[PDB]
Every structure is written in C-alpha cells, then in structure tokens.
C-alpha cells in the first residue's frame, strides 16, 4: 500500500515498521505532481543495502565536501554529517564534481560509488521533524537521526513526543516517495532532566525525590536502563535505533542490544564511538583494534566518529602552522612530500574538467 | 542520438538546433549517474507546448515566490525573471509547489491550469559560465533561460563568442538531461562596441577609419541590420531569437521577425515590452491595446514586461504608505476591502499544516 | 555602571530598567575588543527619541528592501518585520544606505528627515537563543527586537522563563554595547496553557480542577488579567510593553495601559493592529479613522500592521496580472501613468555608480 | 586632505600612493551618514604595523574559521584567504569567539591579538572592485589582492585597465572611510595571452608573430620582465606588489625586487611560495629553510601559501579514513593520542562560553 507511494523502496524495507498516518494521508499531502529526488532514492537504497550485507559500516563526521570526499576516496562506505541540509548538499555536490572529473578525465570509477550514502543529524516538535526531513531529502541524505533530547546538562522529551517526532519524519519520507532511513537516537544515559513525567513510561526513571528545577522540569535517574525501555518504545518507528553514550563499553553495548533484540528481535543499531572519549587510557590496543568489529556482530551496523572531521582539521592546522611558524618552508615541504608518498595509497589530490568542457563546447 | 539523452524531450524538439558536441562528449562530462530534474523537465515541456499551441505567451518580471504565485493564480502561464536568479528561480518553484499542495489537501481540485508555470531566466563572463548558470538554473526548475551577446554604451562580443556561450547552455541543457529552452538576445540595435573585430561575420559593421577606442574597442555600426546578421547566425543554435529593443516598435519588429524568417521560416521568436518606454506618451491607445497580439501574428511566441514586479511593488507600497501616514487605519481597511472584493476573481490572499499534523496526530 | 558600557545611550535611557547581570558580567562576554554598531546605535536613538516625542510612531511591516524603502520615502518614520529576520534587516539597511547615497551624490539635499528609519524587528527556543538572535539583529542594524512568551492553541512559558528571555536579550546589547529596545509580547490574551506552573505568579490563573493535557500542559484561564500581570511582571526588563490581540477594541487597549501604568506609570506600549481583524465589519468609520491617535494618547507609542507588505505586494500583483491577461500592455501603462501621477507626490521609481565611474575615470 | 576622510590612518599611511579621485569625489560618494567598520580599521592598522616592524609575515591559505582560528593560535600572524567575503565574515566570527572564549572563561589573552589581519583575493571591471572592495571592508579584511588577468592559458589585462581597478578599490576604501590594505598582482610570469595591446607599455612584450588566437586575443612574451614593467607601473596605486611565480626561485625574486626598488625604492614585496612546486625535489634543505628569511630581507614583507589548508585538509582526512578503514579505531586513538601531545605545545581543542552566558542571565 506504501510500497507504490514509494516506488524505488526495496523488497522488506517496511518489515515491522508501523506509521500513525494512512496511504490516503499521503496521497492528500503530496501534491498533484511527482517530484523525483535521485539521490536520496540511491542514497538510502545503497545504505539500506550496506547495513544489511556488511559486517558493519562505518563512518567518519565531514565538516565539508572535500573532506567526505578523501572519505569516499579512501574507501570508507558512507559519511555522517553532524546548515546540515545545506552541507548534505554542499557535500554531493563535491561527490558528484570527483565522479564527473573521473569520467571526464577517461578515468574508470575508482570505488564503490562516489555517492556514499550521507546519514545526517536532524537538529521544534512534529512539524519541524516533518520539515527538515523534506529539506535533507532534497540535499540527497541517505538517512537522518532524530533524538529525543530538547535543542544541569541535557533535556529529555517525553517518549510519546518524540514518537510523534518519528512519525513526522517518515510522513515526510513517505510524502517526498523515498525509503529514507530513520534513526532514532536516546540521549537517556546521560540526560539528567526531563520536560515533562506526562508519560507513565516515564515515570519510572524519574527521580520524583529530587523535586523540579527552578525552571519546572522533572529529574530523572540516567543510565542504560531509561535507553532500553526508550528505544524499545521507538523501535517501531525507526529504521536503527542509536544509544548515545560518553563511556564506550563493549559489555554495555552488549547489555543494550541483547534487550533490545528481547523485544525486536534482529533490529539494526547505530553506534558513536564517543571522540572526547580517552581510548588509550581505558582500553587496551586489542581491545581498541577490535572494538568496532565486535559492535558490528552484535547488530551496530552503522557505526560512527561524530566529530572526526573537527579533530582530524583543528589538529592537522595547529602542527601545520606551528612549524610554519618555525621552520617556514620546511615544515610544508614535510607536508608536500607526505601527500607524494600517500599517491600509491590513492591520494589524487597531488596528482581537467573544465578542459574538457572546453572541448566539447568547441 | 539526443534523444536517448533527454528522455523527457518531445518529437521534435531537436529539428534545426545545431550542436558543436557530440552524445559522446554528454556521457563523459554527464558522469557515471543520472540525477532527475523534475520540475526543469516539466517546465521546459510546457513552454514548449505553450509557445507552439498559443498565439503567444505573455510574461511579467517576478521579484518573489509571492508575485509569481499571484501570476499564475491570476492565469498567466509563464513567469520572467532577471547566482541570485537561480535562488530566486528556486524560490519562485517553491512557492508554486506550496499552492499546489494547499489546493492538493483540499480535494477541491486545483483553481489553475497547473502551479508550475514555466519560468524564463535572464542569465546575466564567458562559455564556461553560461554551462554553470545553466546547470544551476535546471536544477532550480527553470524551464528556458536566456544569454544575451553584450559584454557585462553596450560592448558586443564577436558573433562567434556568442555562439559559444550558447552551445555551452545547449551541451549543459544536454548534461542535466533535460530539454530546457535557449533564448538568444542580440543588443546590437543600440551598441556601437565591439570587443574584436576577430569574426568575418562582424567585420563589415566595424568603422575602421574610426580608430579602436582608449579602452582598445572597435566602433560599430548600431541598428536592425547586424541584429539580423547576428540572428540568423544564433539561430541554430537557440531555441528563440531576442533583439533587445529601446524603443518599442511595430514596424522595426516586423522588419525583423521577416529578416529572421527568410533565413529560418517559422522560427520563434522573443520580445521585451520595455518598462522604460513611456508607452501612452509615444503610442496611441489602439497600438498599446494591439500590442503584443500584433506581435505574437508575427511570431513573437514568449513576449515579457521585465521590471514588471519590480514597478508594481514600489508603487503599491508608496501609495499604501502614503494613505497609512494620512490616514493610518483606514488606508489599511480600504486595500483590505479591495482584498474581499477581489476574492470574486480568485483572489486568495485573504491549512496544509493543519492536515499535516491531523496525519501525525492519529 | 552600564553607561560606559554602552556610549551612544542618551540620558536616562536606562530608567526604571533592572538587569539581573553586572557590568562585569558584561565586560567578561565581550572580549578584548570593542567593534562599533553605527546603524544599531543610530537606530536604537532615532526610535527612542520618536517614541518619547511623536503623539504616535507607526508603522507597516516590510518585506523586502524596497517596500521598507518606500514606506520612508512616503514619509513613515519606522519600519516593522516579522535567521532570515536579521538578514531581511540587513537588507533593509542596505537599500535604505544606497538611496541616502545615490541623494547625497545628487548634492541637492535629502527628501526625507534621514533614510535610516528604524527598523523593528520580531524574534520569532530558550534564553541563550534569545542572547544570540538579539546579537545577530543589532549587527544587522535592527533599533528594536520584540520577544513573546508563547512557546514556539497557544502555549505560554512561564513569566520567570520569559523575564530570562528579556534579560538575555539586554545582556546581548549591553554586550554588543548598544542601546537597543526590548519589547515584551504577552500571549496571555488568547493563550489556554502553559508550560509548567512552577512560577507562583502564573498558578493563580491555573485550572487544577482539570487535569494536564496528554502532552503535559497546564490548563490556563486566559484574557486580561494575565495579561495584565504578565504585563506588569515584565516592566522592568523591557522598554515598551506589548499585549496581543484578535480582537482591536479601545475600550480593553484602555483597560490594559490604566492597569499596566497603575503600577509603571508613563511605560511606552506598542500595538499590532490586526491585519487579519475585518476592520470595516466590525468597527464604524469613525473607531476607523480614529483608532491609532486614540491608541497613541493611552501610551501605545509604537503601532504596526504585521503583515502590511504581505498583503500589499499580493493584491497588487494580483490584480496587475489580471489586466495583463485581460489586455496586456494597456494594463501595464495604466500602472506607469500611476506612477508618474504619483512623482507629484514623491514618488521616484520611475545615477550613483555613474558619479563612482566618474571619480575612477579622472 | 584625505587623511581626515580616513580617521584610523597611521602617520604616513599613504607616502608615495596616488589616487585618480578627489576628497570631494569621497565626500560625494559616501552617504550623509558615518558607519564604522572597526575589524577593518584594526586589522588594516596591525597588518600596515606589523610589515613595517617584523623581519616579513608569514601566512597561510585557510578555508575555514576553526583553520584561521588554530592558525592564529599557533602563533601566526595573519590569514591568507583564497564567497571570499563571506568566508572573511565567517574567519571574523570564529576568531571574535576564541576572544570571548577566552574571556568569559577568565582567561588571559594567548595572542597578540586573537583578530590577526586577513588578506584576500578579490575575484568585472572597475565597478567590480570597487563593489567587492567594499564587501571585504564590511567582512572585516585588512587587505585586498587585485590580479591583472581575466578571471591557452590565463590572459591578461592592459596595464591601463587593471590601474583602473586598483584606483577603483581605493576609491571604495576611501568611501568606506578604511586604510585597507591594496594588493596588485601580477600574472604576466605565466600568462601567454592578452585582451588588447591598446596600452604602448604591453606592445614590447607583444608576440605579434603569432597572430591572434581564434577568439581574437593577442599572445604575449611571457616571464620575469612583463611582470618587471607592469609592477612598476602598479606601484603608486597599490601598497603592495605581488609577482605570482609557479617556480620559487631566490635569484629571479632578488631580480624582481631589485628592479621594482631601482624606481620605487623600498617598496613593500608580497610572494606566494608555490603549493605546486616540488620544493625537496629541486631545492636543498638548507635552501628550504631558509627560503622565507631570505625573500624577507629583499623586502618580501608578505609572504603566503595560498592552499595550504586545502592540501592540510585533503591529506589530513584521507589518511584518517585510510587508517579508519583497515584499523578502525586504533587510527582514531592514533590521532587522539597525538592531539593530547600537542596541548603542551598549546593546543586546546582537546582541553564554557555558553555556560558564562546562562550564569550572567540567571
């Protein structure tokens, strides 16, 4: 029934998922004309097709298109984002310039694809939800994370409200015609406040005890368990569900699938490998070297360093500059050489388009 | 073949067009994937129907999403409009889209033709930025767009520049798939420039006994007859012919339109009813009243008033200003009961949401 | 001392306002360097200077640089309009900037008392985004920013929320160091819930007879009297107090300003008179005619008509491409000959970068 | 006379610099109004300062504010900029809140000055750059470059019309009221083609003998003595002259000021160290080393990399993702772990604002 609204949906996309709203609501909302959106359509079907056939994918955070780009380069299979719909389209804009240059150049396709998917963060109730799916549709987004948190520390939302939340956004898929992903993110183990105990399944991790803030909102009782009883709530609702977490832990990832797949059994899941986290410190090389594969095994099949592209930039700049200052031509002659030797790797950047653009007009 | 390459082409479309590439040069600059662009697509398609089924279609210059929308709402078929334009293209469609789904929502049918008029875009440095603009104005949704042959007194560029600008929109038109219109706009009826003198075509209008200018120009004879020149060489390679007029004229049009038409029988042509001209002062009421249909009989098929929103907006809002600073409340009450009074004629202006969040809230 | 703080601040600007932060709090947010706001500054103290010595400052709301440009041209002394807020002021200050420039090139004096009318503006989550939209608008070069206490039927925040709103937005200019206006919008009128009853001032008007709503908000007893308190309760953090209405009625305007000066005697108050309100059908000419003086002599100092501009630019468009489809160019050069009757009065949209060229040209 | 029109001008400001226009002109074209732009002032008076006094300042090309922002921290003195004013905007923000950071943390300031001057490229004729100019001064840059080519190969402009330009953005600096800082670059080095050989000071360095191109360019000798003439024709319109070289070379820069110097003694130099160039394959490391002293003192006092950060950026994140690929995490720990090592050297990214702000409005 939904399947024809969105006709580039994959055999089982909907399998388990259940919507508020009907085919008639989404026939009534859509318009009279049919709007193709060609990389959200490829984006979320390939994304629908990794998570489903790999071990796990996994993703590094790209504060700009070049950076998603070397990404794609360097072989990694999709790109999170965390002005995101803009980036989103900043972002395949500058992947589909590396295909074209490719093709233009005579050049064979030198990955996968060059359209990775993008799985953005969505950051108002139902209506904006409903609105900025629509927009990272439009921009080419693969899939996009909504949480549960509003705008000491973090606010939870009742768990009714942000099901609406979900809902809205895959009203906004389905009026739009593409099987976009929908993660739903908890921000329960670490969220120490709450806007409302409307919800009685809320009620029992509010810590009733501590009163209200002086600004009205409720306490509540963080940790694992409030994330499992929340992500068993929007398990119907999402595509991966996703517990954000500070302290990354093998044991606890463990703790939270194996309830979660109680409830919903083979239910895919999405993990941040916290980057404010001190690895080294914590864990061991082995269990550092192996700790994403074993992620994947319990069913975190899009995992993820949020803020990547921030280290990765901020770092690469201050050593840069800083030997710069003091060795001027030195230290970018460390870089230079850096770049030339990465070239067997498949770094390009050292090593056209609009040459044979000129030709062709010619 | 083209028409593999623009699936949504018509029959036809291609008779007498003219490219400098080949199908080949579209693949390999086009990449390894194909991007729908809906709208683009669709707007081209009607224009083109539009120009060949009416005795002509008649535009205004729109400055926002609102004045087009109040165009088609009040039957125009087609919107004009002069990296700003493609914004502002982008918008415009936006807002059709929006109406289009209000009306849509409430399954009354559509009070319109249809809300995506078509929209004709002035691209106002070189061939390769007539290809980007025009890639940026088919991803917008816009359905023809138009490239003028003055350097941005007026300069002329050589005859043979200028079709390449215009081969550069072709082959971009090309790239993106679709079949989007080319408009080609000569101002050589009032400048007496010419950057070289380069083009064979060009040559027998320069003054060489008059040197080069200080600025290294070539003077020029001005006037109808290198605007016919120009033309008939721009002809196969646009899909209507513009000469840029100061002084709006029915004979000088027929003179040109019959030039153009010994050279191409049946080709469509353009014109500009310049906002400028004082047209009560230097026409007689019959002629102002016959105007454009006089005009559309010799084939001028997309006829325009430029600054039209532009005239319209300032002086509305004097007025109104006026009254308020007079009056205050009562300047106000009197445009709203012109509002009331014009809702007998389809005015609006005086839900979706609503449904939206019904579909949400089930 | 806040005085220091914030140089270009007339006498006694301050009066009456309370700040829950220190001039220290100030200079720790600031930084090191101190960077100018000139159009902010001289909007800020043009608009302080017309509310205390015009009987009425009224205005229209704007929507485009041009309308707002006209509104001062016909002799209006302040603009309204309701991210893309400060950027629509941004532009506003431009085109108003390039008409002063293109009067002064001109040598023959300026038609207006100055082209730098001020602009207030509408800051439509919580305190910090209030501090950063109030930033972003007087870099703009905005002279007011009004802040409502409904959350975005209507659901109120409670008035300790919305007085940390107000005060954020002070912090915000005494940072920037301007003296920008602050108006407090009330909500209350029409508003049947609320947030939280946390506050004690807003649990008098609170139903605890009925339950919460199922998303968990306090059901309120709305009309006059929270307004009232609301009202009186915000005082000291704003500089003109703003009650919103459906319903224009002077006999409640009346009723609102005696309770609100009982209390804040001489408190500036500023009124949206109602474009949605059917003016005609529910008041006689007279109430008309009358009803901004009347307002102005209760202490309404600043009054506008929100969506002014909206309507306006609708109609107008509306009813000029109507007569174009109907006749073509007769109905446009009905609209010139328009425009030219209005140049008695004027009216100039019917020169600088000439006088630019020139003085590069030496 | 124009030192009063300019009222931040340090003494000696503008020794030896000719302007085309007048005081008069200025007051003409400035508005009846003063608007201050201090981040211009300031960094136009540092950048002016800091040529004057250091041995030479070394930049680096960012793309982004966090890239200027670490740059800065580093201990840097100015930004190269290579959506340039936007991006300005941007770099001025970013910088602002390290500042404010800072100072809301109560800590001292870490710099000189967080705000280091940002010199950038302007990408028309005359009214182009002085358009642009403006927008730059409004950004908050310290200086602006103007290039004499013409946005096979690159072609250049007449010596005449690119002086044009360079009165041009004066004339806007003097409107404006800022010392900004004029950079005129020359691209005669490498480029084989000219617009016009109207001006009798490009006809020596004409190759006559190889005809006009087939779009009517002339072809020209291009290396070190075009860019010898044609510097010494900028200087008295400019306050720095800039050779762009593709091949570094001490000798042909000691050539190039010498020859500059023999008719504008002590002129200020600006050199771009080619990104492009192989600089260990053809120069030794002592040569490397000390390659930006050297140039210093011949009086290079402005030296850059135009795309460092994008060559920092593009293998700083292909290598991460390479890492990330095969070895997942451990990669990521690798790059923790040495952001960790640098907070000594001072680093912070790894080791607030928003919290001093709450405190202040609570």
């Given at each position: 029934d939904f399947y024809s609204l969105i006709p580039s949906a994959p055999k089982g996309?909907?399998?388990?998922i259940e919507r508020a709203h009907t085919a008639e609501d989404v026939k009534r909302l859509r318009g009279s004309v049919e709007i193709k959106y060609s990389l959200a359509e490829m984006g979320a079907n390939r994304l629908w097709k990794l998570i489903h056939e790999e071990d796990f994918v996994n993703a590094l955070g790209a504060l700009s298109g070049n950076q998603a780009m070397q990404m794609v380069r360097a072989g990694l299979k999709a790109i999170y984002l965390s002005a995101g719909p803009e980036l989103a389209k900043r972002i395949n804009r500058t992947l589909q310039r590396a295909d074209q240059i490719e093709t233009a150049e005579g050049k064979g396709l030198?990955?996968?694809?060059?359209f990775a998917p993008i799985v953005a963060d969505a950051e108002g109730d139902p209506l904006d939800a409903f609105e900025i799916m629509k927009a990272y549709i439009e921009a080419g987004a693969a899939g996009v994370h909504f949480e549960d948190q509003l705008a000491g520390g973090k606010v939870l939302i009742p768990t009714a409200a942000h099901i609406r939340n979900l809902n809205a956004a895959r009203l906004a898929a389905d009026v739009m015609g593409t099987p976009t992903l929908i993660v739903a993110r908890t921000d329960?183990?670490?969220?120490?406040?709450?806007?409302?105990?409307?919800?009685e399944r809320d009620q029992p991790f509010v810590?009733?005890?501590?009163?209200?803030?002086?600004?009205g909102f409720y306490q509540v009782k963080n940790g694992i368990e409030p994330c499992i009883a929340r992500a068993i709530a929007y398990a119907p609702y999402c595509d991966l569900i996703w517990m954000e977490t500070s302290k990354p832990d093998l044991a606890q990832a463990r703790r939270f699938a194996e309830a979660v797949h109680k409830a919903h059994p083979g239910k895919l899941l999405a993990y941040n490998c916290s980057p404010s986290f001190n690895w080294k410190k914590n864990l061991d090389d082995a269990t550092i070297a192996k700790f994403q594969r074993e992620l994947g095994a319990m069913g975190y099949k899009f995992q993820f360093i949020t803020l990547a592209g921030f280290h990765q930039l901020n770092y690469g700049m201050f050593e840069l500059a800083r030997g710069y200052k003091d060795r001027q031509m030195a230290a970018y002659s460390e870089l230079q050489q850096a770049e030339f030797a990465a070239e067997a790797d498949g770094?390009?950047?050292?090593?056209?388009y609009f040459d044979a653009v000129s030709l062709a007009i010619t």
């Amino acid at each position: 029934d939904f399947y024809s609204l969105i006709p580039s949906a994959p055999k089982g996309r909907f399998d388990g998922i259940e919507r508020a709203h009907t085919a008639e609501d989404v026939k009534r909302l859509r318009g009279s004309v049919e709007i193709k959106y060609s990389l959200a359509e490829m984006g979320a079907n390939r994304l629908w097709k990794l998570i489903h056939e790999e071990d796990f994918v996994n993703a590094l955070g790209a504060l700009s298109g070049n950076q998603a780009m070397q990404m794609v380069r360097a072989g990694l299979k999709a790109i999170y984002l965390s002005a995101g719909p803009e980036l989103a389209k900043r972002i395949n804009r500058t992947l589909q310039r590396a295909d074209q240059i490719e093709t233009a150049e005579g050049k064979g396709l030198s990955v996968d694809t060059w359209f990775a998917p993008i799985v953005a963060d969505a950051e108002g109730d139902p209506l904006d939800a409903f609105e900025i799916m629509k927009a990272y549709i439009e921009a080419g987004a693969a899939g996009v994370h909504f949480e549960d948190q509003l705008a000491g520390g973090k606010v939870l939302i009742p768990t009714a409200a942000h099901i609406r939340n979900l809902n809205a956004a895959r009203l906004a898929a389905d009026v739009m015609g593409t099987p976009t992903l929908i993660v739903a993110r908890t921000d329960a183990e670490a969220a120490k406040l709450l806007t409302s105990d409307i919800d009685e399944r809320d009620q029992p991790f509010v810590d009733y005890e501590a009163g209200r803030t002086a600004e009205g909102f409720y306490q509540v009782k963080n940790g694992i368990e409030p994330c499992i009883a929340r992500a068993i709530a929007y398990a119907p609702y999402c595509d991966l569900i996703w517990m954000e977490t500070s302290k990354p832990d093998l044991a606890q990832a463990r703790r939270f699938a194996e309830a979660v797949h109680k409830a919903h059994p083979g239910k895919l899941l999405a993990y941040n490998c916290s980057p404010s986290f001190n690895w080294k410190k914590n864990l061991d090389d082995a269990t550092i070297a192996k700790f994403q594969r074993e992620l994947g095994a319990m069913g975190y099949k899009f995992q993820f360093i949020t803020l990547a592209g921030f280290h990765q930039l901020n770092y690469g700049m201050f050593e840069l500059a800083r030997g710069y200052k003091d060795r001027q031509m030195a230290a970018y002659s460390e870089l230079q050489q850096a770049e030339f030797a990465a070239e067997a790797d498949g770094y390009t950047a050292t090593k056209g388009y609009f040459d044979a653009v000129s030709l062709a007009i010619t």
